[PDB]
Design an enzyme around this catalytic site. Structure first.
Site, PDB file in Angstrom:
ATOM      1  N   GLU A   1      -0.066   6.963  11.123  1.00 48.64           N
ATOM      2  CA  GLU A   1       1.058   6.441  10.586  1.00 48.64           C
ATOM      3  C   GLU A   1       2.196   6.175  11.500  1.00 48.64           C
ATOM      4  O   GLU A   1       2.211   6.754  12.444  1.00 48.64           O
ATOM      5  CB  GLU A   1       1.490   7.552   9.511  1.00 48.64           C
ATOM      6  CG  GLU A   1       2.308   7.188   8.642  1.00 48.64           C
ATOM      7  CD  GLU A   1       2.693   8.158   7.318  1.00 48.64           C
ATOM      8  OE1 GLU A   1       2.387   9.081   7.435  1.00 48.64           O
ATOM      9  OE2 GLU A   1       2.868   7.201   6.225  1.00 48.64           O
ATOM     10  N   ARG A   2       3.154   5.317  10.921  1.00 48.91           N
ATOM     11  CA  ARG A   2       4.287   5.148  11.845  1.00 48.91           C
ATOM     12  C   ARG A   2       5.135   6.419  11.611  1.00 48.91           C
ATOM     13  O   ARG A   2       5.133   6.983  10.560  1.00 48.91           O
ATOM     14  CB  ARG A   2       4.977   3.814  10.918  1.00 48.91           C
ATOM     15  CG  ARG A   2       4.530   2.564  11.146  1.00 48.91           C
ATOM     16  CD  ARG A   2       5.493   1.390  10.465  1.00 48.91           C
ATOM     17  NE  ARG A   2       4.665   0.115  10.538  1.00 48.91           N
ATOM     18  CZ  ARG A   2       3.788  -0.144   9.387  1.00 48.91           C
ATOM     19  NH1 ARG A   2       3.908   0.518   8.224  1.00 48.91           N
ATOM     20  NH2 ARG A   2       3.135  -1.125   9.393  1.00 48.91           N
TER      21      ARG A   2
ATOM     22  N   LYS B   1       0.787  -1.208  -0.008  1.00 46.47           N
ATOM     23  CA  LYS B   1       0.066  -0.011  -0.003  1.00 46.47           C
ATOM     24  C   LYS B   1       0.810   1.302   0.031  1.00 46.47           C
ATOM     25  O   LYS B   1       0.663   2.217  -0.795  1.00 46.47           O
ATOM     26  CB  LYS B   1      -0.918  -0.039   1.352  1.00 46.47           C
ATOM     27  CG  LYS B   1      -2.045  -1.007   1.039  1.00 46.47           C
ATOM     28  CD  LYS B   1      -2.532  -1.368   2.583  1.00 46.47           C
ATOM     29  CE  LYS B   1      -3.108  -0.453   3.283  1.00 46.47           C
ATOM     30  NZ  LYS B   1      -3.071  -0.329   4.688  1.00 46.47           N
TER      31      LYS B   1
END
Ligand SMILES: Nc1ncnc2c1ncn2[C@@H]1O[C@H](COP(=O)(O)OP(=O)(O)OP(=O)(O)O)[C@@H](O)[C@H]1O
Ligand SMILES: Nc1ncnc2c1ncn2[C@@H]1O[C@H](COP(=O)(O)OP(=O)(O)O)[C@@H](O)[C@H]1O
Ligand SMILES: [Mg+2]
Ligand SMILES: [Mg+2]
Lengths: 460, 86, 173, 51, 505, 115, 49, 171, 85
Positions: free
Chosen positions: A182-183, A156
């Site tokens: 998000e990371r 993705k």
């Protein structure tokens, strides 16, 4: 002056009691001093006599029963305009890039209604991208929604970086990136990549990451939509990238039960459909301006049956379905050509040739899947010679769907390729018509146009 | 909050007599009937496992001894029973 | 909020007050108990984990001016189940019950200016005839009405203020 | 095309009608403020309290 | 211009006061409001909120009323005043709203002026009784060869289009609507949970490829409150029931009944009602059952008594085509199995046939029609009996086909004819086909005129046959379209037409 | 004379309150004048305090919270015998046909013990 | 045609601003059923245009 | 840093939550299990030299601090669909799958390529290791496909024979 | 019960290397008390996006399959997952 007092702190949910006159209304903001930290609360329910139940936009630690609360008589409001371009912000529209004040001219509330039905604008302005399978199986138009479905680790983020590179750079308009859940590392890497490429001057970034309490992860998407809608109302064409709709729904799920709600079918909140709809119906192209959006959709357990991917399927123009099976086999991107489609794939909207090519590719691969187990158990030579021809062409076609990306160059050690749509149609037409029956399977693997296929075939 | 088996006329008897022992500990009244399970009030002389004798020739087996009520199951047709039966 | 908890105890109290011809006394005794409920340090004691009987005796001790039938027993029965905060609710319930039995309606009116006694008397009789009760009008002079009057009879209301007609015409437009 | 233009005409005429209606009713409110008194209040009451 | 209109509207005003019951909002959350008071409230009543918004009184508890908001709820507040109206939910009905797009409350979202309805009807109504209902023996032509030949639909029947996502459910529904341009059958399209831009695309298609003048479009997008979505199909049912009991025929489509079930789930859970199998409330069956049992065919005495003698001998009807989305094709789920039990016949749309390009992707053997051949017209009935048998034989023999040769020629022909009749039953999206055209194409298949043309040209062959027949043998087309009849002379005339066509391209 | 009051209506479930002497038995039938129609309720559970919880044998729409409920002493009773032959009936033993009244001589309760 | 009817709207705005005075007094007199005092009209101009 | 068993931490937190009468979610775990693991794992990071210099009040300059984390999860009969493994899989930058079948077959360590990936990828290797590992990754994954596809063909094309034998060698 | 207004803190320093310690900082190896460089809070927040740096340095597992096919870098987060034993 302060007007309310905290009466309950259960996990991330805070109850505040006010005088029975001038009780805060739903989706308002409140303020309290968590020691030296200014903490914002968002009202979610008016319940009982004078009591409102709220969600903390920050860490709930350090809160005591009896603390004073000040009720701001507006929702959470964020800066909007050109001043947001090139800056990282949190859910509350506060800078987290240490460059100083935003300097905004106008501030907008993040809770607002969707466009009326007669405001909607129709469009069929096809975008071209370098990725073969996406342009072939699911071409999409300017002003529409795109969703990249996939399980864990199926591609993705890499596909979204490639699409950012391909679309946004040719796009002359402003763009918004909403990093929902998000990371932290990947957000930092994206920021530095844009800063190096000198495209950061036309992108506004809103980041709410994994480590932050549920309210931030819940409302950061609305912040991103607010900025995008400001640009849309100015009349410009906007590009909106959302990192995961899934964790918007999941941030809802975490706090749903603490709000007193009864759980739904698979443990979700009872309001999953409405919570999805209120957010996703704002992302539309109106008559004044257009928003074009790309969304990454997590698929729990790689099962498309789950309610979250199931409901978000019904909101999108074009759906590129990635599959862990194809990723595990090593074909990249891992798009499933049988599942991926687009509602712009009409013989009227696209070239009639384009439509027939896509239909033929899908038919051939569907015919291969049924033969997979037949051949696996009973043997290759049980087939008829026509069936063996079909098997050959199927494997060659399924190789030609693969592609190297510029942003997938670090993982593999090869240059990146961009293929024009005309070349893609020409190559697949040639393969199906048998003009390249005699080339081996790897002559189509990880190449660009079909001319590059014959060049690599010569090298082979 | 919930209405924990507290009702007007039982409360009014407690109002007239704060100590309940004026009535014999061998008797009680049916307070609820729900699909076979029955809920008696009183019976300060009851132990778990007894054979509580209902009106007619029917028996109910004491199962739960709560703070203020006895829970039993009716052995036979339970539909004939109402509130207030001794 | 515990209205439904108050309804059983309130029905017991009211049903008992007419058996002993002291509704007028019972109402003020319930007010007495509510005032006890309102005290700060008593509220902290109520929040504590005391056993119901000793807590009830600590509550009774500050309310010695109560009858044996009324105070000492209702307080203790409520303490057995911890519903003492329902005393404020029981009081209002008790008043409404009384007004039902006595065929009375506490009809409330609001006006932009003070009414003459003849006007108020006509309104009283007219509502006694609209309803089937002895009404008891109470008026408040609020300029928000602009003119005309409001008539509220519990849930039912009749609005004759010109502000209502103004905004009604605005909604017709 | 002509149908769309006619619909636009109808829509705009209704829009402007509603704007001027807003203006008219606001003016009426101010007129009431500039004209109402106790005698008018009692007249209104006596028309009301008949029912 | 604007005065006089405003003058007359000023004259339409009342000065004296009115009596009514006033409630107070105690709590607001997630589209549900808790209201204190309104001792005179009743089950299913409309409560008037400030701002001209309405709420529906669902829960009547001993000390509070739980009502659901039909509109935006974010600004309602504790202590606000609400007025009870005495009305169970009403919606406008008439021919004036025929051809327009509205919401659940009946207000137009069209942007093209107000309604000229003839009256109002209650959203909730009881279905016609056992003795008041008539047998279904009139056709509903959907315009697709496969459905009209194998899975016939009758005026009063309730067919179920059940399938997976992106398989042609919406397409089949809207093409039926489009095919009712020139019948006396009025059409209704209910868009439940559909995203707004798709609804706009469908509306533009409806006016573009035919008549939107014959269809009422009910719209409830994903952004509107759960109560509105929940009650949208019932409001559409009221609008259809008007035509049903006026002595005229109608056709209604419920898009994504599953999403209506989702809305009802949300409403029930927020009111704290006990949950069931898939968290759905206990009466979800009683939701879809009482929704669908209002679709029926009606006898002459009922409609004449209802219309008070305006018409004497006609028989009205309301055909229904609900749509259900299965997930990965699970037919044993709670909502699909409830709907399958409620309806009589389903059109099953399988996904791997759609991906194969065989569109529309109807699947014989699993898709049936419980009303039988009494719904077909005679010529379609005569020319479709053998299609069933040919396809049934093809299904089992084609599995053997892929790896077999040197077979019995009877089996060879059975197999090959099955393969080409499978090829025949597929067509472009927005091309509906008249009864004569379908009839002669099926006749060409059944009488063997395709037996020597069993190759890829069949689509071009069909197009050329239709063009030629239009060119020179129109009178039979007119006679067949008018009658639907069949006899020896018609049989021979069809033979002559096909014999002549085989000479041409 | 009707001796009961409705206290709740939640969907098809109706709770009604009686005096403590008159509480119905478990499967008794009650009747209410909903609108102009008569609505039959079948008792399901005896909650405490004289409240009984019932299921409405018909449409629940239009029911208020203060309506008077009449307490029939028998369960649902239906006509039985030869008169029922050739007739269509609903749950309550009333004609959904239009031929007319069933001329029964006997009416039996639908609840009884097995042989 | 859209530009043409935009100009039409300008004309109509000016024309109906004259009518709003009539309509304002009509509504005021209707809702109190009395001949409105023609005094203290200094604020009518801001309501007019 | 090694977290020997995140699942047992999750179970302990579940016990705490249920004893506290908090509302339960999927598989009785409270919803903030994801918050637990996320706020734990995101603490593992690499920080730029400006951060180190600011924290140490100027004492340390020109150095980047770094902490690498290896959480461990137990699957019950390989059910990846479970709640806790789904969450943890969604968080980390990679996965290393250990399988009972491979372990019994003698492939130890029982690493399964194609279901295990490293998102940092070639950047997290010496240049020699980057160069050499690039081919191995694709080789094994496509070897298993060929091995499944050609169980029963007694004779075979020697291109696929070469890949089959080479995959056997690398395994 | 008194309420000490301080969150849970743990001993930290270089002297912990080689020591077996419980959750609260108490040694259980029995080799004497700790030599800690002050205390630190157990529950803290992570560095932000602007405070991060990318991962480009390897750390060797010592195995072949891991270090070749699934490399680990300094700053990476790797999930080791499987059945029991
Ligand atoms: N006969 C046909 N020929 C070609 N395309 C077709 C045909 N029938 C349907 N399609 C295509 O199938 C796609 C999906 O159509 P449709 O929206 O009707 O499906 P669905 O199963 O109802 O989907 P969903 O549940 O997502 O709304 C569209 O792109 C449409 O163009
Ligand atoms: N096109 C590609 N080329 C090479 N490797 C890829 C490609 N797509 C995905 N991968 C590998 O799979 C990993 C997981 O996908 P990624 O997009 O990073 O996360 P997710 O798919 O979960 O968003 C990538 O980091 C990379 O290791
Ligand atoms: Mg990702
Ligand atoms: Mg569709």
């Amino acid at each position: 002056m302060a007007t309310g007092k905290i009466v309950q702190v259960i996990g991330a949910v805070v109850d505040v009691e006010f005088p029975q006159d001038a009780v805060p209304r739903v989706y308002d903001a409140l303020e309290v001093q968590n020691g030296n930290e200014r903490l914002v609360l968002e009202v979610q329910q008016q319940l009982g006599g004078g009591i409102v139940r709220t969600i903390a936009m920050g860490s709930s630690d350090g809160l005591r029963r009896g603390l004073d609360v000040k009720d701001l008589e507006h929702p959470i409001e964020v800066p909007v305009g050109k001043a947001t371009l090139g800056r990282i912000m949190n859910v509350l529209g506060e800078p987290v890039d240490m460059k100083g004040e935003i300097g905004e001219e106008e501030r907008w509330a993040i809770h607002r209604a969707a466009p009326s039905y007669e405001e909607l604008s129709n469009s069929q302005e096809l975008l071209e991208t370098g990725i073969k399978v996406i342009d072939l199986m699911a071409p999409f138009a300017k002003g529409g929604k795109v969703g990249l479905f996939g399980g864990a680790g199926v591609g993705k983020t890499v596909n979204m970086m490639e699409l950012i590179r391909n679309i946004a750079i040719e796009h002359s308009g402003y763009s918004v990136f909403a990093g929902v859940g998000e990371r932290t590392r990947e957000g930092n890497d994206f920021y530095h990549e844009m800063t190096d490429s000198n495209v950061i001057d036309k992108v506004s970034l809103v980041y709410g990451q994994m480590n932050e309490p549920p309210g931030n992860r819940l409302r950061v998407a609305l912040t991103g939509l607010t900025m995008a809608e400001k640009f849309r109302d100015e009349g410009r064409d906007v590009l909106l990238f959302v990192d995961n709709i899934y964790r918007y729904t999941l941030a809802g799920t975490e706090v749903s039960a603490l709000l007193g709600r009864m759980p739904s079918a698979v443990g979700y909140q009872p309001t999953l459909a409405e919570e999805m709809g209120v957010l996703q119906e704002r992302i539309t192209s109106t008559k004044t301006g257009s928003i074009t959006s790309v969304q990454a959709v997590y698929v729990p357990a790689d099962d498309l049956t789950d309610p979250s991917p199931a409901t978000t399927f019904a909101h999108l123009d074009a759906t590129v379905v990635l599959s862990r099976q194809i990723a595990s086999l090593g074909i990249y991107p891992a798009v499933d050509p049988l599942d991926s489609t687009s509602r712009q794939l009409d013989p009227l909207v696209v070239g009639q040739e384009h439509y027939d090519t896509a239909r033929g590719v899908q038919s051939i691969l569907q015919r291969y899947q049924e033969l997979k187990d037949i051949i696996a158990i009973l043997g290759m030579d049980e087939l008829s010679e026509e069936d063996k021809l079909v098997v050959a062409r199927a494997r060659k076609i399924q190789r030609f769907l693969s592609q190297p990306f510029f942003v997938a160059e670090v993982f593999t050690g090869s240059p990146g390729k961009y293929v024009s749509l005309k070349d893609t149609i020409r190559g697949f037409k040639g393969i199906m018509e048998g003009e390249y029956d005699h080339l081996p399977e790897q002559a189509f693997y990880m190449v660009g146009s079909i001319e590059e296929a014959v060049e690599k075939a010569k090298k082979l | 909050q919930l209405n924990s088996t507290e009702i007007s006329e039982l409360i009014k008897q407690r109002i007239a007599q704060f100590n309940v022992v004026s009535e014999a500990h061998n008797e009680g009244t049916i307070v609820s009937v729900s699909d076979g399970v029955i809920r008696i009030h009183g019976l300060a002389d009851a132990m778990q496992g007894e054979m509580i004798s209902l009106p007619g020739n029917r028996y109910a087996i004491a199962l739960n001894l709560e703070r203020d009520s006895v829970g039993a199951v009716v052995m036979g047709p339970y539909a004939d029973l109402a509130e207030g039966m001794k | 909020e515990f209205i439904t908890v108050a309804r059983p105890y309130a029905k017991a109290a009211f049903d008992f007050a007419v058996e002993h011809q002291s509704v007028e006394r019972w109402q003020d005794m319930l007010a007495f108990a509510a005032e006890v409920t309102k005290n700060e340090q008593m509220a902290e004691l109520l929040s504590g984990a005391l056993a119901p009987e000793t807590l009830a005796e600590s509550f009774i001790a500050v309310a010695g001016e109560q009858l044996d039938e009324n105070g000492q027993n209702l307080i203790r029965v409520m303490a057995e189940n911890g519903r003492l905060n329902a005393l404020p609710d029981v009081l209002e319930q008790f008043i409404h019950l009384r007004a039902v039995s006595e065929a009375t309606a506490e009809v409330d009116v609001i006006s932009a200016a003070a009414l003459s006694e003849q006007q108020l008397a006509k309104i009283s009789a007219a509502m006694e005839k609209r309803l089937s009760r002895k009404v008891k009008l109470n008026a408040k002079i609020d300029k928000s009405v602009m003119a005309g009057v409001i008539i509220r009879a519990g849930d039912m209301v009749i609005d004759g203020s010109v502000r209502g007609r103004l905004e009604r015409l605005a909604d017709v437009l | 095309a002509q149908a769309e233009i006619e619909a636009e005409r109808k829509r705009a005429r209704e829009e402007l009608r509603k704007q001027v209606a807003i203006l008219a009713v606001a003016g009426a409110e101010k007129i009431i403020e500039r004209s109402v008194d106790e005698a008018a209040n009692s007249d209104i009451v006596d028309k009301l309290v008949a029912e | 211009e604007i005065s006089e209109l405003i003058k007359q509207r000023i004259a339409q005003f009342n000065v004296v006061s009115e009596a009514h019951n006033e409630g107070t909002i105690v709590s607001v959350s997630d589209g549900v409001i808790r209201i204190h008071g309104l001792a005179d409230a009743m089950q299913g009543e409309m409560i008037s909120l400030p701002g001209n918004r309405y709420a529906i009184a669902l829960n009547l508890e001993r000390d509070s009323v739980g009502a659901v908001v039909m509109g935006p709820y974010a600004d309602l507040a504790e202590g606000m005043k609400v007025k009870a109206t005495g009305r169970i939910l009403e919606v406008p009905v008439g021919r004036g709203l025929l051809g327009r797009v509205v919401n659940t409350l009946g207000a137009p979202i069209d942007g093209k002026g107000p309604l000229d309805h003839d009256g109002f009807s209650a959203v909730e109504a009881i279905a016609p009784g056992v003795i008041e209902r008539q047998s279904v023996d009139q056709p509903v032509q959907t315009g697709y060869k496969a459905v009209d030949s194998m899975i016939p639909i009758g005026r009063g029947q309730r067919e179920l289009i059940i399938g997976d996502r992106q398989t042609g459910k919406t397409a089949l529904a809207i093409d039926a609507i489009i095919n009712q341009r020139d019948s006396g059958i009025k059409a209704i399209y209910v868009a439940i949970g559909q995203k707004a831009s798709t609804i706009s695309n469908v509306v533009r298609k409806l006016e573009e490829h035919g008549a939107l003048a014959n269809t009422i479009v009910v719209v409830a997008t994903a952004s509107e409150s759960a109560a509105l979505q929940y009650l949208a199909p019932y409001a559409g049912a009221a609008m259809g029931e008007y035509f049903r009991d006026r002595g005229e025929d109608a056709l209604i489509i419920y898009d994504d009944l599953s999403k209506q079930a989702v809305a009802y789930r949300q409403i029930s859970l927020l009111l704290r009602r006990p949950p069931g199998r898939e968290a759905f409330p206990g009466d979800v069956f009683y939701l879809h059952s009482r929704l669908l049992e209002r679709a029926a065919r009606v006898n002459a005495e009922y409609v004449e008594a209802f219309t008070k003698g305006e018409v004497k001998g006609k028989t009205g009807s309301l055909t229904a085509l609900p749509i259900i989305e299965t997930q990965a094709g699970d037919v044993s789920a709670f909502v699909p199995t409830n709907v399958i039990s409620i309806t009589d016949g389903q059109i099953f749309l399988e996904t791997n046939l759609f991906n194969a390009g065989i569109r529309p992707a109807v699947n014989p053997g699993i898709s049936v029609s419980r009303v039988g051949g009494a719904a077909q017209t005679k010529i379609m009935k005569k020319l479709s009996g053998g299609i069933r048998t040919a396809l049934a034989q093809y299904r089992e023999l084609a599995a053997f086909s892929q790896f077999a040769s040197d077979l019995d020629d009877a089996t060879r022909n059975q197999l090959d004819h099955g393969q080409k009749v499978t090829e025949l039953l597929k067509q472009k999206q927005y091309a509906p086909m008249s009864v004569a055209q379908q009839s002669l194409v099926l006749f060409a298949a059944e009488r063997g005129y395709l037996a020597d043309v069993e190759l890829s040209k069949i689509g071009s062959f069909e197009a050329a046959l239709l063009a030629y027949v239009d060119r020179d043998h129109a009178p039979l087309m007119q006679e067949i379209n008018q009658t639907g009849g069949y006899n020896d002379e018609i049989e021979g005339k069809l033979k002559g037409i096909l014999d002549s066509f085989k000479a041409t391209q």
